[PDB]
Structure formats: structure tokens, C-alpha cells
Amino acid sequence: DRELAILATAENLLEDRPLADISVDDLAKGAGISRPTFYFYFPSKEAVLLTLLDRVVNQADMALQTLAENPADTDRENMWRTGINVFFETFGSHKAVTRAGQAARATSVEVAELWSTFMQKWIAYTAAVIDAERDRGAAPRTLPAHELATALNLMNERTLFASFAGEQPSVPEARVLDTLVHIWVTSIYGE
Amino acid sequence: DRELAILATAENLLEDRPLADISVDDLAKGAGISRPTFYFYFPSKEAVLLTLLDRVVNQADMALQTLAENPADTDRENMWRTGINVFFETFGSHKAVTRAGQAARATSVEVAELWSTFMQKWIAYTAAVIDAERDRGAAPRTLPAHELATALNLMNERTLFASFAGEQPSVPEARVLDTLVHIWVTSIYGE
Numbered sequence: 001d002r003e004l005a006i007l008a009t010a011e012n013l014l015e016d017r018p019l020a021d022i023s024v025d026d027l028a029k030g031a032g033i034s035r036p037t038f039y040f041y042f043p044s045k046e047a048v049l050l051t052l053l054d055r056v057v058n059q060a061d062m063a064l065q066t067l068a069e070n071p072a073d074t075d076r077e078n079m080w081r082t083g084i085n086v087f088f089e090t091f092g093s094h095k096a097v098t099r100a101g102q103a104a105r106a107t108s109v110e111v112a113e114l115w116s117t118f119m120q121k122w123i124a125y126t127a128a129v130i131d132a133e134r135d136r137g138a139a140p141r142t143l144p145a146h147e148l149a150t151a152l153n154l155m156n157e158r159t160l161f162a163s164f165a166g167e168q169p170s171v172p173e174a175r176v177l178d179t180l181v182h183i184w185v186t187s188i189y190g191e
Numbered sequence: 192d193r194e195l196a197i198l199a200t201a202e203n204l205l206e207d208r209p210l211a212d213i214s215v216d217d218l219a220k221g222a223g224i225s226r227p228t229f230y231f232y233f234p235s236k237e238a239v240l241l242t243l244l245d246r247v248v249n250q251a252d253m254a255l256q257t258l259a260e261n262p263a264d265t266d267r268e269n270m271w272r273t274g275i276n277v278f279f280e281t282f283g284s285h286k287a288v289t290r291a292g293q294a295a296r297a298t299s300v301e302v303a304e305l306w307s308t309f310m311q312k313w314i315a316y317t318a319a320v321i322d323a324e325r326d327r328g329a330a331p332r333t334l335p336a337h338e339l340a341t342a343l344n345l346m347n348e349r350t351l352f353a354s355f356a357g358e359q360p361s362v363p364e365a366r367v368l369d370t371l372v373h374i375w376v377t378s379i380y381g382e
């Protein structure tokens with residue numbers, strides 16, 4: 001639609017500059033519509049970023065749902081690698097939306113609440129799998145599962161997103177998946 | 192001095208509202224000086240937060256230097272707990288400066304560079320200790336030490352600061368030290 005064109009324009013421009021430096025007029029021009037026509041689709045450029053983030057977050061969530069329904073046939077190291085890889089590939093394929101969406105957590109209650117809702121969901125799912133591993137005798141009962149899950153999820157948020165943004169310091173993007181898998185597997189299966 | 196009074200006023204006000212909602216006039220009034228007298232001590236309210244952050248960061252750094260010079264007489268779990276505790280206690284004793292200083296990373300190159308410099312230093316020291324543990328045969332050679340150190344340091348930044356801010360999600364403050372120690376010890380000593 002024109003909606004999909006505004007979203008694509010926003011994602012393209014965000015690869016060059018922050019949302020602060022993008023105007024409604026910029027988004028309209030790229031989508032081949034006028035400013036008032038823009039306001040028919042979105043109330044604000046902040047609504048455009050919220051929608052972009054919502055789509056990327058739901059893409060990751062559905063990928064993880066897909067894996068949870070269809071468990072891959074592998075050792076525990078590859079089970080966790082496959083789950084972390086959802087986030088690495090999904091967010092790493094949308095770096096500009098990731099960077100801008102994280103930055104908007106500071107200024108938008110709707111972005112903060114979106115991020116908070118899905119992090120809670122991914123932590124609860126992490127904990128449920130760690131608890132399943134403990135129930136079947138493959139993982140030791142150490143930390144409370146939900147506390148362990150929370151810190152591992154927060155580690156992944158900061159570490160993946162520092163890598164994608166090329167922050168100093170950061171793990172290089174080509175090393176970050178193996179880095180996180182090591183810490184997940186040792187902390188989940190380690191006495 | 193009047194300098195110390197401005198710094199104390201800023202830290203007190205930051206416990207109530209963001210730097211965005213604090214004026215130079217607010218800082219002058221609390222310190223018992225006029226606005227132009229304020230500008231004799233600091234160029235801007237942003238300089239006041241930079242100085243507060245610089246003092247808290249250097250306090251943590253010196254505490255860690257103190258431990259590095261005078262190694263406590265304990266098992267490896269208590270060695271790592273004592274190091275992480277520097278950050279938990281130092282930043283956890285200055286939550287308002289922590290929150291505001293992290294938020295200012297987005298808008299101030301000097302705050303971003305301060306934070307980046309010390310994180311590099313703390314990661315290099317982490318890696319140097321992991322490498323010492325590997326050299327003496329107490330830790331296995333798994334991940335490259337500096338990559339492991341980077342992800343553990345970034346985990347601590349996000350997890351400690353989410354706890355202090357009471358974010359949803361977060362580990363409760365009373366559980367966060369034990370949570371992080373578990374993940375450091377298992378990931379550093381785990382095959």
C-alpha cells in the first residue's frame with residue numbers, strides 16, 4: 001500500500017540519520033504522497049517507528065514460536081544457538097530500526113511498553129525451557145530459572161545491540177552469537 | 192566549596208526529576224549562589240552531570256584498583272563476587288547519577304566517551320584475570336578471554352542498571368549480585 005511505502009521509506013532513511021533528523025515531509029516525499037495524505041496513514045513520524053519496531057519484534061516472536069512448536073533435532077548447545085540466532089538474524093537484518101527503536105525507549109512510553117511486553121514474554125519462555133531441562137534432569141537446579149532467564153535476556157539485548165551498532169566496546173558481529181551461546185550453555189548447565 | 196554544593200544540589204535534584212527538568216537557576220539556588228556565579232564553576236548543567244558521573248566512575252575504578260593490589264583471601268566464587276560488588280555498591284549508592292549518566296550517553300559525546308573509556312578498562316582487567324586463571328590451570332581455555340569479558344561486562348551494565356531503575360523486566364536488587372556471580376563463575380570456569 002501507501003502504508004508499506006511509508007514504512008519502507010522510514011526504514012531506508014533511518015539507515016542514514018536518526019528519527020530526530022527525519023521530517024513527516026521526508027517520509028511523504030519518499031512514499032510519493034503529500035503531508036496531509038501521510039497523516040491519513042500515521043499520526044506522527046514516531047508512530048511510523050513504533051510500527052516498524054512492532055513488525056520486527058513480532059517477526060522475532062513468531063520465529064521463536066515456530067521453533068518452540070517444531071523442536072530441531074540437536075544437542076543442547078545447538079538448541080540454545082538456534083533460539084539466540086532468531087534474535088541475531090531478525091534484529092541484525094533490521095539494524096536501523098533496532099538502533100532507532102532502542103533509542104525511542106527513552107522518549108516514547110509506547111515503544112518502552114512494546115519492548116517491555118516482549119522481553120517479559122521471551123524471559124518467561126526462556127525460564128519455562130530451563131525449568132523443563134531441570135525437570136528432565138539435564139540441567140542442575142542453581143539460580144531461580146526466571147532470574148537466570150532475565151539476566152541472560154538482558155545480556156543478549158545489550159550485547160547484540162552494541163555489536164550491531166559497532167559500539168566501543170562491543171563483541172564483533174561475527175563473534176557475538178558464539179559468545180552468547182557459550183555464556184547461556186555454561187550458566188544453564190553449570191553447577 | 193561552592194563547587195561541591197552545586198554537585199550535591201544536582202545529585203539531590205536528580206533523585207526527583209531528569210536533567211531535562213532541572214535548570215541552571217535550580218542548581219544555583221540550591222547551592223546558595225546566583226546564575227552568573229554558577230557559570231564561574233560549570234559551563235552548563237550537562238557539565239555538572241558529566242562531573243558527577245566522572246566522580247562515581249572513578250570511585251568504582253579506584254575500588255577495583257584497591258582489590259587488584261590487595262587480593263582478598265577466598266575461593267574463586269568470592270573473588271568474582273567481590274569485584275562485581277564494587278559496581279553494585281558504587282553505582283547502587285548513586286542511582287540518580289547512574290540513571291541520568293546512562294541517559295546522557297544518547298545526547299553527550301563526552302558522557303559516551305567517559306563511559307566507553309572505563310568499560311574498555313574494566314573489560315581489559317576482566318580478560319587479564321580470566322587469562323591469569325587459564326595460565327594457572329584453574330579455568331579452561333573456551334571463548335577468547337576478551338570476548339567473554341566484553342559480554343559479561345555488558346551483561347552487568349544492563350542488568351545492574353535495569354535493577355537499580357526498577358525496570359520491567361529486571362532482577363530484584365536483592366537478587367542481582369548472586370544472579371550475576373552465578374553467570375560469571377559458570378561461564379569463566381565451565382567447559
Ligand SMILES: O=C(NCCC(F)(F)F)c1ccc(-c2csc(CNS(=O)(=O)c3ccccc3)n2)cc1
Nearest residue numbers: 067068071072079082083084087122126129156157
Ligand atoms: O536473545 C534472547 N533474548 C533477548 C532478545 C534481544 F536481544 F533483546 F533482542 C533470547 C534468546 C533465546 C531464547 C530462547 C528461549 S527457549 C530457546 C531455545 N530454543 S527453542 O526452544 O525455541 C528450540 C530451538 C531448537 C530446537 C528446539 C527448540 N531460546 C529466548 C530469548
Ligand SMILES: O=C(NCCC(F)(F)F)c1ccc(-c2csc(CNS(=O)(=O)c3ccccc3)n2)cc1
Nearest residue numbers: 258259262263270273274275278313317320347348
Ligand atoms: O560489573 C563489572 N563491569 C560492568 C560495570 C557496570 F555494570 F557497567 F557498572 C565488572 C565486574 C567485575 C570485574 C572484575 C575484574 S577482575 C574481578 C575479580 N575481582 S579482583 O581481582 O579485583 C579481586 C577480588 C577479591 C580478591 C582478589 C581479587 N572483577 C570487572 C568489571
